[PDB]
Protein backbone atom coordinates (compact mmCIF):
# COMPACT_ATOMS: atom_id res chain seq x y z
CA UNK A 1 0.00 0.00 0.00
CA UNK A 2 1.81 3.10 -1.40
CA UNK A 3 5.34 1.89 -2.18
CA UNK A 4 5.95 5.02 -4.29
CA UNK A 5 4.98 7.65 -1.66
CA UNK A 6 8.15 9.74 -1.93
CA UNK A 7 6.12 12.68 -3.35
CA UNK A 8 3.69 12.67 -0.40
CA UNK A 9 6.52 12.45 2.15
CA UNK A 10 8.44 15.37 0.60
CA UNK A 11 5.32 17.45 0.35
CA UNK A 12 4.42 16.66 3.99
CA UNK A 13 7.89 17.73 5.08
CA UNK A 14 7.57 21.10 3.27
CA UNK A 15 4.06 21.60 4.65
CA UNK A 16 5.27 20.86 8.20
CA UNK A 17 8.18 23.33 7.93
CA UNK A 18 6.37 26.12 6.06
CA UNK A 19 2.63 25.84 6.82
CA UNK A 20 2.74 24.29 10.32
CA UNK A 21 0.49 21.60 8.92
CA UNK A 22 0.62 17.80 8.71
CA UNK A 23 -1.01 16.47 5.53
CA UNK A 24 -2.75 13.13 5.17
CA UNK A 25 -3.49 12.04 1.61
CA UNK A 26 -6.64 9.95 1.97
CA UNK A 27 -6.55 7.43 -0.87
CA UNK A 28 -8.69 4.34 -1.65
CA UNK A 29 -7.65 1.08 -3.37
CA UNK A 30 -6.92 1.53 -7.11
CA UNK A 31 -4.43 4.43 -7.13
CA UNK A 32 -1.38 4.86 -9.37
CA UNK A 33 1.43 3.58 -7.11
CA UNK A 34 4.15 5.18 -9.24
CA UNK A 35 6.98 7.68 -9.06
CA UNK A 36 5.64 11.20 -9.54
CA UNK A 37 7.63 13.95 -11.19
CA UNK A 38 6.51 17.18 -9.51
CA UNK A 39 7.72 19.44 -12.31
CA UNK A 40 4.33 20.27 -13.86
CA UNK A 41 2.97 21.21 -10.42
CA UNK A 42 5.30 24.24 -10.57
CA UNK A 43 4.32 25.61 -14.01
CA UNK A 44 2.15 28.32 -12.42
CA UNK A 45 4.83 29.44 -9.95
CA UNK A 46 6.15 33.03 -10.35
CA UNK A 47 9.51 33.14 -12.17
CA UNK A 48 11.27 34.57 -9.08
CA UNK A 49 10.35 31.29 -7.30
CA UNK A 50 12.19 29.02 -9.84
CA UNK A 51 15.96 29.27 -10.20
CA UNK A 52 18.50 27.19 -12.11
CA UNK A 53 21.98 26.65 -10.61
CA UNK A 54 24.92 25.50 -12.80
CA UNK A 55 27.50 25.12 -10.02
CA UNK A 56 27.81 21.38 -9.43
CA UNK A 57 31.06 20.73 -11.32
CA UNK A 58 33.09 22.09 -8.33
CA UNK A 59 32.67 21.85 -4.55
CA UNK A 60 33.42 25.54 -3.94
CA UNK A 61 30.91 27.04 -6.42
CA UNK A 62 28.11 24.78 -4.97
CA UNK A 63 29.07 25.64 -1.34
CA UNK A 64 28.80 29.28 -2.44
CA UNK A 65 25.30 28.82 -3.98
CA UNK A 66 24.20 27.01 -0.79
CA UNK A 67 25.71 29.66 1.51
CA UNK A 68 23.60 32.27 -0.36
CA UNK A 69 20.35 30.53 0.62
CA UNK A 70 18.22 31.89 3.45
CA UNK A 71 18.19 29.22 6.20
CA UNK A 72 14.47 29.73 6.95
CA UNK A 73 13.53 28.93 3.31
CA UNK A 74 12.52 25.48 1.99
CA UNK A 75 12.89 24.41 -1.67
CA UNK A 76 11.82 21.62 -3.95
CA UNK A 77 15.18 20.81 -5.51
CA UNK A 78 15.72 18.81 -8.73
CA UNK A 79 19.00 17.10 -9.59
CA UNK A 80 19.79 15.43 -12.89
CA UNK A 81 20.18 16.57 -16.48
CA UNK A 82 17.96 18.89 -18.54
CA UNK A 83 16.81 16.37 -21.15
CA UNK A 84 16.89 13.36 -18.84
CA UNK A 85 16.22 11.70 -15.52
CA UNK A 86 15.49 14.20 -12.78
CA UNK A 87 14.97 13.58 -9.13
CA UNK A 88 13.09 15.81 -6.75
CA UNK A 89 14.00 16.25 -3.09
CA UNK A 90 13.27 18.79 -0.40
CA UNK A 91 16.09 21.11 0.60
CA UNK A 92 15.82 22.55 4.14
CA UNK A 93 18.18 23.76 6.89
CA UNK A 94 17.94 21.50 9.96
CA UNK A 95 19.16 23.75 12.81
CA UNK A 96 19.67 20.63 15.02
CA UNK A 97 22.43 19.34 12.69
CA UNK A 98 23.63 22.82 11.62
CA UNK A 99 23.48 22.11 7.87
CA UNK A 100 21.39 21.90 4.71
CA UNK A 101 19.55 18.58 4.27
CA UNK A 102 18.18 16.88 1.18
CA UNK A 103 15.09 14.80 1.90
CA UNK A 104 13.74 12.56 -0.91
CA UNK A 105 11.80 10.09 1.25
CA UNK A 106 11.80 8.63 4.72
CA UNK A 107 14.55 6.16 3.51
CA UNK A 108 16.68 8.50 1.35
CA UNK A 109 17.98 11.73 2.75
CA UNK A 110 21.31 13.26 3.67
CA UNK A 111 23.05 16.18 5.26
CA UNK A 112 24.44 18.32 2.47
CA UNK A 113 26.56 20.73 4.50
CA UNK A 114 28.35 20.84 7.90
CA UNK A 115 28.16 23.53 10.65
CA UNK A 116 30.74 25.64 8.77
CA UNK A 117 28.87 25.59 5.42
CA UNK A 118 31.07 23.02 3.68
CA UNK A 119 29.87 19.90 1.89
CA UNK A 120 29.79 16.62 3.75
CA UNK A 121 30.84 13.35 2.09
CA UNK A 122 27.19 12.97 1.09
CA UNK A 123 26.98 16.62 -0.04
CA UNK A 124 29.96 15.99 -2.31
CA UNK A 125 27.74 13.31 -3.87
CA UNK A 126 25.76 16.16 -5.57
CA UNK A 127 28.83 17.19 -7.58
CA UNK A 128 29.24 16.02 -11.17
CA UNK A 129 32.91 16.96 -11.85
CA UNK A 130 33.31 15.26 -15.27
CA UNK A 131 30.38 16.50 -17.29
CA UNK A 132 29.12 19.91 -18.26
CA UNK A 133 26.60 22.05 -16.39
CA UNK A 134 24.14 24.50 -17.95
CA UNK A 135 20.70 25.04 -19.50
CA UNK A 136 21.13 22.96 -22.64
CA UNK A 137 19.87 19.42 -23.09
CA UNK A 138 22.09 16.83 -21.47
CA UNK A 139 23.78 19.37 -19.16
CA UNK A 140 23.64 18.89 -15.43
CA UNK A 141 21.90 21.52 -13.34
CA UNK A 142 19.99 22.09 -10.12
CA UNK A 143 16.46 23.57 -10.22
CA UNK A 144 15.31 25.25 -7.03
CA UNK A 145 11.62 25.91 -6.58
CA UNK A 146 10.56 27.85 -3.50
CA UNK A 147 8.28 25.76 -1.30
CA UNK A 148 5.95 28.72 -0.88
CA UNK A 149 2.44 27.98 0.39
CA UNK A 150 1.30 28.15 -3.25
CA UNK A 151 3.89 25.63 -4.52
CA UNK A 152 3.23 23.24 -1.64
CA UNK A 153 -0.50 23.36 -2.42
CA UNK A 154 0.08 22.84 -6.16
CA UNK A 155 2.39 19.88 -5.46
CA UNK A 156 -0.12 18.30 -3.06
CA UNK A 157 -3.05 18.71 -5.46
CA UNK A 158 -1.04 17.53 -8.47
CA UNK A 159 0.02 14.30 -6.70
CA UNK A 160 -3.47 13.68 -5.32
CA UNK A 161 -5.17 14.03 -8.73
CA UNK A 162 -2.38 12.21 -10.59
CA UNK A 163 -2.74 9.17 -8.30
CA UNK A 164 -6.55 9.13 -8.22
CA UNK A 165 -7.00 10.05 -11.92
CA UNK A 166 -4.10 10.87 -14.26
CA UNK A 167 -1.46 13.49 -15.17
CA UNK A 168 -3.74 15.48 -17.55
CA UNK A 169 -6.50 15.86 -14.96
CA UNK A 170 -3.85 16.91 -12.37
CA UNK A 171 -2.45 19.67 -14.59
CA UNK A 172 -6.02 20.95 -15.20
CA UNK A 173 -6.91 20.77 -11.50
CA UNK A 174 -3.81 22.81 -10.58
CA UNK A 175 -4.66 25.43 -13.22
CA UNK A 176 -8.20 25.95 -11.74
CA UNK A 177 -7.50 25.58 -8.01
CA UNK A 178 -5.24 27.29 -5.48
CA UNK A 179 -6.41 25.70 -2.17
CA UNK A 180 -5.65 22.20 -0.83
CA UNK A 181 -7.94 19.56 -2.34
CA UNK A 182 -10.71 18.77 0.27
CA UNK A 183 -9.57 15.12 0.52
CA UNK A 184 -6.08 16.15 1.67
CA UNK A 185 -6.60 16.37 5.43
CA UNK A 186 -4.56 18.97 7.21
CA UNK A 187 -4.01 19.09 10.95
CA UNK A 188 -2.28 22.05 12.50
CA UNK A 189 1.04 21.50 14.26
CA UNK A 190 3.65 23.67 16.00
CA UNK A 191 6.55 25.23 14.01
Amino acid sequence: FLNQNCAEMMIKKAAQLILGSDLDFEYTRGIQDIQVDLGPAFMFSPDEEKTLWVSGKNQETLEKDLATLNKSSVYFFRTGTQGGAGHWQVLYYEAAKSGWVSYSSQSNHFQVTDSNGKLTASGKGLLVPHANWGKENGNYAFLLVNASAENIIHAANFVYILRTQNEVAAIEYCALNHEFHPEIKRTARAK
Partner: protein, 153 residues
Protein backbone atom coordinates in the same frame (compact mmCIF):
# COMPACT_ATOMS: atom_id res chain seq x y z
CA UNK B 1 1.64 34.87 -46.81
CA UNK B 2 0.97 38.66 -46.79
CA UNK B 3 -0.60 38.89 -43.27
CA UNK B 4 2.88 38.24 -41.86
CA UNK B 5 3.25 36.42 -38.57
CA UNK B 6 2.82 36.93 -34.83
CA UNK B 7 4.79 36.10 -31.71
CA UNK B 8 3.65 33.75 -28.94
CA UNK B 9 5.72 32.58 -25.96
CA UNK B 10 6.19 29.01 -24.77
CA UNK B 11 7.10 28.99 -21.03
CA UNK B 12 8.92 25.87 -19.68
CA UNK B 13 9.33 24.10 -16.29
CA UNK B 14 12.75 25.81 -15.72
CA UNK B 15 11.44 29.43 -15.91
CA UNK B 16 12.70 30.12 -19.49
CA UNK B 17 10.38 31.60 -22.19
CA UNK B 18 10.90 30.49 -25.82
CA UNK B 19 9.55 32.58 -28.75
CA UNK B 20 7.81 31.30 -31.93
CA UNK B 21 6.69 32.95 -35.18
CA UNK B 22 3.10 31.79 -35.92
CA UNK B 23 -0.27 32.69 -37.56
CA UNK B 24 -3.78 32.46 -35.91
CA UNK B 25 -4.61 30.02 -38.73
CA UNK B 26 -2.01 27.51 -37.36
CA UNK B 27 -2.80 24.22 -35.60
CA UNK B 28 -1.41 23.04 -32.26
CA UNK B 29 0.59 20.23 -33.99
CA UNK B 30 2.31 22.81 -36.23
CA UNK B 31 3.25 24.71 -33.09
CA UNK B 32 4.75 21.57 -31.49
CA UNK B 33 6.60 20.95 -34.80
CA UNK B 34 8.11 24.47 -34.55
CA UNK B 35 9.06 23.79 -30.90
CA UNK B 36 10.86 20.63 -32.17
CA UNK B 37 13.29 22.71 -34.29
CA UNK B 38 13.87 25.50 -31.76
CA UNK B 39 14.67 23.35 -28.64
CA UNK B 40 14.91 19.67 -29.81
CA UNK B 41 11.82 17.83 -28.54
CA UNK B 42 9.54 15.56 -30.61
CA UNK B 43 5.79 16.54 -30.67
CA UNK B 44 4.72 13.28 -28.96
CA UNK B 45 6.54 14.02 -25.67
CA UNK B 46 5.24 17.61 -25.38
CA UNK B 47 1.95 18.91 -24.07
CA UNK B 48 0.88 22.49 -24.63
CA UNK B 49 -1.24 23.92 -21.90
CA UNK B 50 -3.06 27.23 -22.29
CA UNK B 51 -5.79 28.90 -20.16
CA UNK B 52 -5.70 25.73 -18.01
CA UNK B 53 -6.48 23.01 -20.59
CA UNK B 54 -4.23 20.78 -22.65
CA UNK B 55 -4.58 21.79 -26.28
CA UNK B 56 -5.59 19.23 -28.94
CA UNK B 57 -3.38 18.85 -32.04
CA UNK B 58 -6.23 19.42 -34.56
CA UNK B 59 -7.62 22.74 -33.24
CA UNK B 60 -6.29 26.16 -34.28
CA UNK B 61 -4.67 28.88 -32.20
CA UNK B 62 -7.62 31.14 -33.12
CA UNK B 63 -10.10 28.49 -31.79
CA UNK B 64 -8.26 28.73 -28.45
CA UNK B 65 -8.20 32.56 -28.60
CA UNK B 66 -4.40 32.31 -28.48
CA UNK B 67 -3.50 35.87 -29.42
CA UNK B 68 -0.45 37.98 -30.17
CA UNK B 69 2.08 37.64 -27.28
CA UNK B 70 0.12 34.91 -25.45
CA UNK B 71 1.99 32.45 -23.24
CA UNK B 72 1.67 28.69 -23.59
CA UNK B 73 3.18 26.25 -21.09
CA UNK B 74 5.38 23.48 -22.38
CA UNK B 75 5.24 20.41 -20.09
CA UNK B 76 6.76 17.03 -20.93
CA UNK B 77 5.01 13.64 -20.70
CA UNK B 78 6.13 12.22 -17.39
CA UNK B 79 9.02 9.78 -17.31
CA UNK B 80 9.75 7.55 -14.36
CA UNK B 81 12.95 8.38 -12.61
CA UNK B 82 14.59 7.25 -9.39
CA UNK B 83 17.78 7.48 -7.40
CA UNK B 84 20.15 4.54 -7.14
CA UNK B 85 23.39 4.18 -5.19
CA UNK B 86 26.71 2.73 -6.38
CA UNK B 87 29.14 1.57 -3.72
CA UNK B 88 32.84 1.35 -4.66
CA UNK B 89 35.34 -0.85 -2.73
CA UNK B 90 36.72 2.45 -1.29
CA UNK B 91 33.34 2.74 0.55
CA UNK B 92 32.25 5.85 -1.37
CA UNK B 93 28.63 6.03 -2.47
CA UNK B 94 27.72 7.57 -5.79
CA UNK B 95 24.12 8.71 -6.22
CA UNK B 96 22.70 8.46 -9.73
CA UNK B 97 19.50 9.83 -11.23
CA UNK B 98 18.23 7.08 -13.54
CA UNK B 99 15.16 5.62 -15.26
CA UNK B 100 14.09 1.93 -14.96
CA UNK B 101 14.52 1.68 -18.77
CA UNK B 102 18.15 2.94 -18.63
CA UNK B 103 20.70 0.47 -19.96
CA UNK B 104 23.56 -0.66 -17.82
CA UNK B 105 25.65 1.26 -20.39
CA UNK B 106 23.72 4.50 -19.70
CA UNK B 107 24.37 3.86 -16.00
CA UNK B 108 28.14 3.48 -16.53
CA UNK B 109 27.96 6.70 -18.53
CA UNK B 110 26.39 8.48 -15.51
CA UNK B 111 29.12 6.97 -13.32
CA UNK B 112 31.72 8.43 -15.68
CA UNK B 113 30.09 11.87 -15.30
CA UNK B 114 30.64 11.65 -11.52
CA UNK B 115 33.94 9.77 -11.31
CA UNK B 116 35.63 10.21 -14.74
CA UNK B 117 36.06 6.39 -14.88
CA UNK B 118 35.50 5.39 -18.51
CA UNK B 119 32.65 2.84 -18.98
CA UNK B 120 35.26 0.27 -20.22
CA UNK B 121 36.91 0.06 -16.85
CA UNK B 122 33.58 -0.40 -14.93
CA UNK B 123 31.98 -3.63 -13.82
CA UNK B 124 28.63 -3.28 -12.05
CA UNK B 125 27.20 -5.81 -9.61
CA UNK B 126 23.64 -6.04 -8.13
CA UNK B 127 22.43 -8.91 -5.87
CA UNK B 128 25.78 -10.70 -6.31
CA UNK B 129 25.52 -10.78 -10.16
CA UNK B 130 27.49 -8.94 -12.87
CA UNK B 131 25.33 -6.60 -14.94
CA UNK B 132 25.50 -6.77 -18.73
CA UNK B 133 25.78 -3.54 -20.74
CA UNK B 134 22.80 -4.11 -23.08
CA UNK B 135 20.18 -5.05 -20.44
CA UNK B 136 18.13 -2.50 -18.45
CA UNK B 137 17.81 -1.68 -14.78
CA UNK B 138 14.25 -3.16 -14.80
CA UNK B 139 15.63 -6.44 -16.21
CA UNK B 140 17.56 -6.84 -12.94
CA UNK B 141 14.59 -5.54 -10.85
CA UNK B 142 16.73 -2.58 -9.84
CA UNK B 143 14.30 -0.16 -8.20
CA UNK B 144 14.38 3.07 -6.22
CA UNK B 145 17.19 3.39 -3.70
CA UNK B 146 18.72 0.11 -4.88
CA UNK B 147 22.41 -0.24 -4.16
CA UNK B 148 24.83 -1.46 -6.81
CA UNK B 149 28.57 -2.14 -6.49
CA UNK B 150 31.31 -0.76 -8.78
CA UNK B 151 34.48 -2.82 -9.38
CA UNK B 152 37.29 -1.65 -11.68
CA UNK B 153 38.71 -3.62 -14.62
Amino acid sequence: GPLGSMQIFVKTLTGKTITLEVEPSDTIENVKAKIQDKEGIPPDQQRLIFAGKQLEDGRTLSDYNIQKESTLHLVLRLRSSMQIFVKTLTGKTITLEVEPSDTIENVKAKIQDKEGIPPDQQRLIFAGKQLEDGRTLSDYNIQKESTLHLVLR
